[PDB]
Amino acid sequence: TLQDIGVSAGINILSAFVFFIIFAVLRLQPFNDRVYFSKWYLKGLRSSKFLNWMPEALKMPEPELIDHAGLDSVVYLRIYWLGLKIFTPIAVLAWAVLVPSMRFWTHIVMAYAFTIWTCYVLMKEYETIANMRLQFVASEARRPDQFTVLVRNVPPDADESVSELVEHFFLVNHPDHYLTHQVVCNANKLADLVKKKKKLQNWLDYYQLKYARNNSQRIMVKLGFLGLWGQKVDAIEHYIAEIDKISKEISKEREEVVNDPKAIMPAAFVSFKTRWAAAVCAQTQQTRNPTQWLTEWAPEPRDVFWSNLAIPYVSLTVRRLIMHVAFFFLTFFFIVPIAFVQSLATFMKSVIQGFLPGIALKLFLAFLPSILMIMSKFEGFTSISSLERRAAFRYYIFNLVNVFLASVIAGAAFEQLPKTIGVAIPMKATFFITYIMVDGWAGVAGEILMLKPLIMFHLKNAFLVKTDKDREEAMDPGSIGFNTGEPRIQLYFLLGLVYAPVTPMLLPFILVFFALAYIVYRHQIINVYNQEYESAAAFWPDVHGRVIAALVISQLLLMGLLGTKHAALAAPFLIALPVLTIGFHHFCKGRYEPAFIRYPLQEAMMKDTLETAREPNLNLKGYLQNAYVHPVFK
Amino acid sequence: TLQDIGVSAGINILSAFVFFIIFAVLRLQPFNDRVYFSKWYLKGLRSSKFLNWMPEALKMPEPELIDHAGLDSVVYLRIYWLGLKIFTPIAVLAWAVLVPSMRFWTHIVMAYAFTIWTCYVLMKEYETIANMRLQFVASEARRPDQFTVLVRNVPPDADESVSELVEHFFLVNHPDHYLTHQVVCNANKLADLVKKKKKLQNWLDYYQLKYARNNSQRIMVKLGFLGLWGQKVDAIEHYIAEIDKISKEISKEREEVVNDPKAIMPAAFVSFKTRWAAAVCAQTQQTRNPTQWLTEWAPEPRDVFWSNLAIPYVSLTVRRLIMHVAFFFLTFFFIVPIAFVQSLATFMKSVIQGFLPGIALKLFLAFLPSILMIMSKFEGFTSISSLERRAAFRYYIFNLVNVFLASVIAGAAFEQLPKTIGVAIPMKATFFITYIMVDGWAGVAGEILMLKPLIMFHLKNAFLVKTDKDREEAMDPGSIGFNTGEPRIQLYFLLGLVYAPVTPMLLPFILVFFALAYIVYRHQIINVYNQEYESAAAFWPDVHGRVIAALVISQLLLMGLLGTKHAALAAPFLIALPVLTIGFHHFCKGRYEPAFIRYPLQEAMMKDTLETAREPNLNLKGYLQNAYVHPVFK
């Protein structure tokens, strides 16, 4: 209802207003400067009107930002821009023809206008990003991955070790390009022990400091609530003893793992003298058996997810299948909070009952990012970049089924107390309007505050910091959050396209959201969020794929909705929409995707040639030899 | 009806019987020995009970035959064998459970039994062929294609020629592997003139000989029926003059084309010092633009279809789209003879009216192979191997729609004078039984006679042969006819699978046909059909693909047919059939297809290594330099 929207909007607008004021004040306090401006310290640049920050955020045009933040951050940010390019003219047209037989034909025509515009824009954006990627890569600094190919499923041999098989194999098949190699080892036990040792030290330091300040008796029952019901009577000597125990376990484990041939996985990082050679290995079949001696570009050293390297290659299919099933159940059992929320969604008292379902849904979805990253880690991927992309994919599907589809269905089920979809879709538009103001407008404004790291920064300074530069760990903003930023906005691209020929009233909320998200994230990208890995926008083709899916869904729903008119004869025309859209997808795929998947040999040659000319005496072997060993082994 | 089948079978059996007798006698006459045994003359091995030939044909186990005939001939022949492996147990089971609620479940169960058996067999056959291919290739003699990659769509340049661009490009990107190259030229006008010159000479020789035998007046009006109404009064001097005219045109054209830079196409055959290098080029992207500097393995010198090399790369899409449309109309307008045949298909007089529709259909389809090769040539492919495979594909589709589907529909339309398919399919089984005996049993038996080349051989000896060794042209058996052999048998694989859970009576005809075709073609492969090109069974994955499609079609038709039972509840089970079948296809595709599409670098290295050791002083450059120029230029 209009009264509900009026009230909900006022609530979210005021919260955003207030959050920005609070932000404006907190950021001026010098004691938290390392939280709000964590970058620039990380980069060695810094030491020691409330909304002015908005226009400041618009400085640093793409080329400055790409070098400052990285390509992924810039390409990600452009997604919000993309949506404005697509939806603004849709909103204008839809409003113009829906807001004051022919209605029937109008909807059909609108579908083509919207599809065509969207496809046009996506084509141009896809191409632009591909060009950005090539320039970025061409000018990229030297990194170990440029010369390194990861070899998987090296076949077993009764006499030769993995190292021996790999060296021989490559000297024969890649003679005078082969440089060196490093065998993958199953050091997970060791790494796990080492991480625990560090955790124990933090607690020891905590208690030593607490005691030094107040020289009294400790009573910590491990967890306090459900720990082991002891007292940790000395607590300093308790943690010292626990540390001494693990220290010995670590010394022992290091000696056993480095002398245990069973710690060797049939995999290795293989390096080459030139990038050209690496480029070749990454793109050709090596042996007769298509699932042996497999090659791919190695992740850069801090993209490598070391835990997954211990998974036998051959077990990956099973892990993936199990998770396909788990995903179903995850999606399936979420219907309970959906139905709950839709039940809730039914004068000041009623406007809040109207408002709150938005929040309830948001809260139930709060732990989804965690669940999905965990199941993604279970499936082996071996890199951070791949895992984050995989989880984003699953999140997206979940939103389609649980946030959009199930909500419409559950909605109709409650309202009802054969094409019922005819009213269920426009009916529930009210819900989505409230929802977008809640995890959207208000959400983004709240995020600029960075309250979570603010608090942890200060607590660490208060209790764990003892000396200088341990404040470097306190100062950790995390990443941009591709994992949640992207599937969230895809929900909105879908809803926009679904309702543009139905309910034009939804689009103004979507447009505000895209505009807001753009300015808030641009601001933060510049000041916070140091990147954990540099992908050259590898995720872009997936973003594209998902938008196309949204077009197909909207087109199909329209066909359904207009399939009620007697002698509608809608299908002879509407069928063209998913056909042409799919055709468009394949065209763009074949024409532009190679930019993101295969490295042209010519680029490798130009790059190798120039590097040599610029640096004629590079000890490449020394450079690459110690890369990719393991962080646990120094 | 049983009476119609009895009579039709007797007719076709007796014709086959007689054809074999005639064959048995004609092959014993020495004057046609070069027709029936054309091979063995071509190979330099030969010079100068009626059915004994059947057991003789079973000698020469695969390895002898592969070397004698070639891999393609053997793999092709194995297709008939494959069908027996699939259909025999189907026929046994179907007969056992259909020939003396439960009927409903029985049909569902049979569908899984049949699908599973078929998939099992296909998997094993696919793998076996892949292994054969690798061994064949590993032991293959040296050929120019092993070192040559065809480069397409070389970008234009204002200053450099195509030759100059190619040499430079490869020296930079493939240094010290690049050996040499040859630029593609548009010599089609010249080649056309040369072919006509030869044709005119044959006519001149004809008339000179005719005259020498009978010194009188010629009156040939060019074509006789609708030629130019003149007399060719001298006919010798007429053909001499026509030849002298074309001779001058040829001399001129040769000088203009070899000095005309516009005759150069932006394409070249590029050779490398090693196979390893060629293997790399064929499998990697060369430049930024994914549709420039494109590489693929060059066809061997007598696979190259020179006419298509004059087609600009960029025009290929349009040519293909136009032909997609043409194919529709081709298929569409064939409905007229289909309806005619089905109209015809409606006591000795009636049994023949019953019989003849088989033949009528066969005759109308007689020119389809020609039509399809022509449209395939229109689309550029550049090789004989590709064109033949392409045409076979289209032929297959035509059979599915026009021979199977349209026949069932037209059939029902006539019998009728909502699921009518429920009776239309088993009803028309009678038609297919007659049809298989006609272009099947009788067909193959007739083919062993080789009457067409028999006649032409003798006519040439009588009128064009003047001297020795021009009988070598008379002796030309043509090829195996993959173009028609394969899509024909796919029709029968489909019909078998469609009717196995419906009408078991069809399968005994199919099994006889496969058995007969096997022995007749095996016989002929050994004695006649010199291969025009050697593919290493590249077509195999397509054969596989088509059988899988047949499984899906049968499974879907069953779902339709059993979807009439009240509360059939067939779909919860039957849906598994196309799902599992598709899964199976992807498994096999990913697991085995690489054998037929990509050459492992290791194989290239092993091959290059051994060849060098065996032949330490090979002038590879001299060997490859003159390959791939053009047959017209000497």
Residue numbers in the entry:
A (entry chain A), B (entry chain B): 3 to 50, 71 to 122, 156 to 401, 420 to 490, 502 to 718
Text lifted from the article:
Previously reported as putative ion channels sensitive to osmolality, a companion paper characterizes OSCA/TMEM63 family members as a novel family of MA ion channels conserved across eukaryotes. The structure of OSCA1.2 reveals a trapezoid-shaped homodimer with a two-fold symmetry axis perpendicular to the membrane. The bulk of the protein lies within the membrane; the transmembrane (TM) domain (TMD) of each monomer contains eleven TM helices. Topological similarities with mTMEM16A suggest that OSCA1.2 also has two pores and could conduct ions through a structurally analogous pathway lined by TM3-TM7.
We purified Arabidopsis thaliana OSCA1.2 expressed in HEK293F cells and determined cryo-EM reconstructions in lipidic nanodiscs and Lauryl Maltose Neopentyl Glycol (LMNG) detergent micelle with cholesteryl hemisuccinate (CHS) at 3.1 and 3.5 Å resolution, respectively. Structures of OSCA1.2 in nanodisc and LMNG were nearly identical (RMSD = 0.81 Å). A comparison of nanodisc-embedded and LMNG-solubilized structures hints at the positional flexibility of the subunits relative to each other while in the closed state.
